[PDB]
């Protein structure tokens, strides 16, 4: 609906990744070096990951996070979590 990546992140992601952390599996934060060690480097990598993520994270399909919104989330993640 034209929401920005940060707003989408606050709604859908920050309940388990507040400030880019991880409240479920603490080592698995969004910090750049950590996520990139598991292959999550680009905007598109983030957008694809949320469709089929690791255990303990729900999948986010296109009905709840449309493709354009998934890319905006990816942009936010890459920009915000060094
Ligand atoms: C919201 C859409 C959202 C995003 C974006 C997101 C991202 C994300 C990444 C990039 C990782 C790192 C994976 C890696 O292997 O390094 C990651 C990992 C986990 N997440 Fe997440 N996440 C989003 C949402 C949520 C929500 C709402 C939860 C909690 C219910 C959650 C949880 C987790 C867990 C657990 C992991 C670790 C998975 C693993 O392989 O061990 N995420 N997330």
Question: Outline of this structure?
Answer:
The PDB classes it as electron transport. The protein has about 80 residues and is mainly alpha-helical.
Note the main attributes of this structure:
mainly alpha, Cytochrome Bc1 Complex, Chain D, domain 2, Lipoprotein cytochrome c, 1 heme-binding site, monomer
Give a description of the structure:
The chain has 82 residues and is an all-alpha fold. It has a single domain, classed as Cytochrome c-like domain (Cytochrome Bc1 Complex, Chain D, domain 2, Orthogonal Bundle). It is 43% helix and 0% strand. It is built from 4 helices and no strands. It has helices at residues 5-12, 32-37, 43-49, 67-80. Helix 3 (43-49) packs across helix 4 (67-80). The chain is globular, with a radius of gyration of 11 Å. The N and C termini lie far apart (28 Å). Protoporphyrin IX containing FE binds next to helix 2, helix 3 and helix 4. Protoporphyrin IX containing FE is lined by residues 12-13, 15-17, 22, 24-25, 28, 30, 34-35, 38, 40, 46, 49-50, 53-58, 60, 73, 77.
């Amino acid at each position: 609906a034209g929401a920005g990546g940060g707003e989408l992140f606050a709604t859908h992601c920050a309940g388990c990744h507040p400030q880019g952390g991880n409240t479920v599996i603490p080592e698995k934060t969004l910090a750049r070096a950590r996520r990139e060690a598991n292959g999550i480097r680009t905007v598109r990598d983030v957008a694809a990951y949320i469709r089929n993520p690791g255990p303990g994270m729900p999948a986010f399909g296109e009905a709840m996070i449309p493709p354009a919104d998934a890319l905006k989330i990816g942009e936010y993640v890459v920009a915000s979590f060094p």
